[PDB]
Amino acid sequence: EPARVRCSHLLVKHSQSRRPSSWRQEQITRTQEEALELINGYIQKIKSGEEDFESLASQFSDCSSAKARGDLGAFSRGQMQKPFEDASFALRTGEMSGPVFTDSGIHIILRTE
Ligand SMILES: O=C(N[C@H](Cc1cccc(F)c1)C(=O)O)c1ccc2ccccc2c1
């Protein structure tokens, strides 16, 4: 395992997220159920080729990393929330995760390095 990985992600928050606000919306109103529906629909569009991961993250991620087209930069273990970390380190470079759940919301992760 490398000391650090670089990943991009797309976060979809919901009304029970730790911080249910984002640069996209003053208050996150969608339900947890709707957030997972959106995540799964993004996964399906990326798998079909209809959408590009980082292009989608740049406009639809609730994380401020949307400004960097979803890029979080490099990180080691012990930094990110544990479910995010474990998913990220389990990816090969070029691989995308399925839904990943944290206190922040629901993510899809693309490992880039
Ligand atoms: O409903 C849409 N987006 C939803 C609702 C929403 C949430 C936060 C910001 C916003 F502009 C829209 C979402 O992103 O979760 C929506 C509506 C029309 C669109 C048209 C083209 C592409 C994406 C589009 C997306």
Domain regions of the chain by residue span:
1-113
Burial 69-90, CB ≥16 within 10 A → b, else e = bbbbeebeeeebeeebbebbbe
Neighbour order of strands in the sheet with 71-76: 71-76, 4-12, 105-111, 100-102
- N- to C-terminal Cα distance for the chain? 12
- 63 CA → ligand 1 middle, Å: 15
**Which residue, by CA, sits nearest to atom 24 of ligand 1?**
60
Task: Check if 44 is active-site.
Answer: no
Query: Do 8 and 96 meet the contact criterion of CB atoms below 8 Å apart?
Result: no
Report the largest interatomic distance among the alpha carbons of the chain, rounded to a whole angstrom: 39
Catalytic-role residue among 14, 58, 63, 97: 63
User: How far apart are the C-alpha atoms of 113 and 41, rounded to whole Å?
Assistant: 25
CATH architecture of 1-113: Roll (3.10)
Rg from Cα positions in the chain: 13
**Which residue, by CA, sits nearest to atom 9 of ligand 1?**
24
DSSP-assigned beta bridge partners for residue 5:
75
